[PDB]
Amino acid sequence: LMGGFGMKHPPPQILIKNTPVPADPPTAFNKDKLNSFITQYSTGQVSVEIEWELQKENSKRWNPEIQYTSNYYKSNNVEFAVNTEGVYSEPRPIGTRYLTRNL
Amino acid sequence: DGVGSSSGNWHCDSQWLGDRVITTSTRTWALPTYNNHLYKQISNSTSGGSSNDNAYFGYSTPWGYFDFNRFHCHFSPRDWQRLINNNWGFRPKRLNFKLFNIQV
């Protein structure tokens, strides 16, 4: 209902964790689980590659259609670009529905 | 062929391949007799022209001719939109011309 593709078997969940590294244990045995760990974090890169299938427009419509565009008029910033402070922003929601079909 | 057979069919569509577009246009024309079948010397004198910048000499013919040399002849406005929004460039490659179903 929020939109998109419903699937019985969607892309699976990808779970990641830093494995705990204990700090120095005591030299006499203790049965309690170790609550003392080395402070730790990880970084890396992720690649996601999705192949998308397209359905072309076959239309016989004579007149030109509505299309999504940028507006030429001068502005302080470029839409869908970085800020003067380095902040990327998305100025507007963009749907998919521009081209037309008969009903 | 014969009086009772069509000598060609109407073909007006456009066809978008990967790197190629094929436009086809069919129209209906009418051809009058021009100049009462005569060739005629014409000039700015025959038309009453005056200024030297506009002076000319030439001939009008009984013949007539086809001009498809504008883009709206070959492209619907939608096809034109489809060309200009998606492409850095285009050029013409081949041409095919037909006259058919002549009625005098």
3-state SS class at B79: helix
- Cβ pair B81:A62 closer than 8 A: no
- Is residue A93 a contact partner of residue A79, using CB atoms and an 8 Å limit? no
Beta strands in B17-99 (DSSP E): 21-23, 40-43, 57-60
Distance linking the first and last C-alpha atoms of chain A: 22
d(CA A48, CA A37): 33
A66: chain B residues, CB-CB within 8 Å = none
d(CA B24, CA B91): 16
Nearest CA distance, B77 vs chain A (angstrom): 5
Residue whose structure tokens are 């100025």: A91
3-state SS class at B15: strand
How many Cβ atoms from other residues are within 10 Å of residue B49's Cβ? 13
Q: What kind and span of H or E run contains B77?
A: helix B77-86
Residue A67 sits at the chain B interface (C-beta within 8 Å):
yes
- Residues 6 or more apart whose Cβ sits within 8 Å of residue B83: B21, B75, B90
d(CA A59, CA A101): 7
3-state SS class at B73: helix
Residue A76 sits at the chain B interface (C-beta within 8 Å):
no
- Is residue A98 a contact partner of residue A68, using CB atoms and an 8 Å limit? yes
Residue whose structure tokens are 């970085």: A82
- Cβ pair A59:B78 closer than 8 A: yes
B81: chain A residues, CB-CB within 8 Å = 64-65, 67
Nearest CA distance, A9 vs chain B (angstrom): 35
- Residues 6 or more apart whose Cβ sits within 8 Å of residue B65: none
- Cβ pair B77:A62 closer than 8 A: yes
Q: Are strands B21-23 and B40-43 parallel, antiparallel or unpaired?
A: unpaired
d(CA B29, CA B100): 11
d(CA A98, CA B55): 54
Residue whose structure tokens are 């998606």: B86
After which residue numbers is chain A interrupted with C–N beyond 2.5 angstroms?
none
d(CA B102, CA B3): 10
What technique determined this structure?
cryo-EM
* Nearest chain A residue to B82, by CA: A64
Q: Using CB atoms within 10 A of its CB, is residue B82 exposed (0-12), middle (13-18) or buried (19+)? A: buried
